[PDB]
């Protein structure tokens, strides 16, 4: 049982490391996508402004 408990603790620590790494990975991906989506929204709003400028003629 001592051997089994030590093995179990090692694998549990491995899984904890895994969840931590995945949490950083998802936080970074989310930030990158937030920046890109803001870029897209800005592009769309500027395009709407352009469209009204051409209609103004």
């Amino acid at each position: 049982l001592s051997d089994k408990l030590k093995e179990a603790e090692t694998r549990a620590e491995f899984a904890e490391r895994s969840v931590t790494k995945l949490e950083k990975s998802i936080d970074d991906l989310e930030d990158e996508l937030y920046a890109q989506k803001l870029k897209y929204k800005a592009i769309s709003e500027e395009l709407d402004h352009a469209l009204n400028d051409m209609t103004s003629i």
Partner: protein, 56 residues
């Protein structure tokens, strides 16, 4: 994007210039037309005054 904005603005400017040339041509045409009307009125006035002087 930004290039589209400025290019469209320059186009807008070209269109205003074209309308400006049209307006200048139309103003000169209006001046010439006013001169033509004045000349035609003087011409008819001269023709009948000449006819009257000939009768006298």
């Amino acid at each position: 994007m930004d290039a589209i904005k400025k290019k469209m603005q320059m186009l807008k400017l070209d269109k205003e210039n074209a309308l400006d040339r049209a307006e200048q041509a139309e103003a000169d045409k209006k001046a010439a037309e006013d001169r033509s009307k004045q000349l035609e009125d003087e011409l008819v006035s001269l023709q009948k005054k000449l006819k009257g002087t000939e009768d006298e």
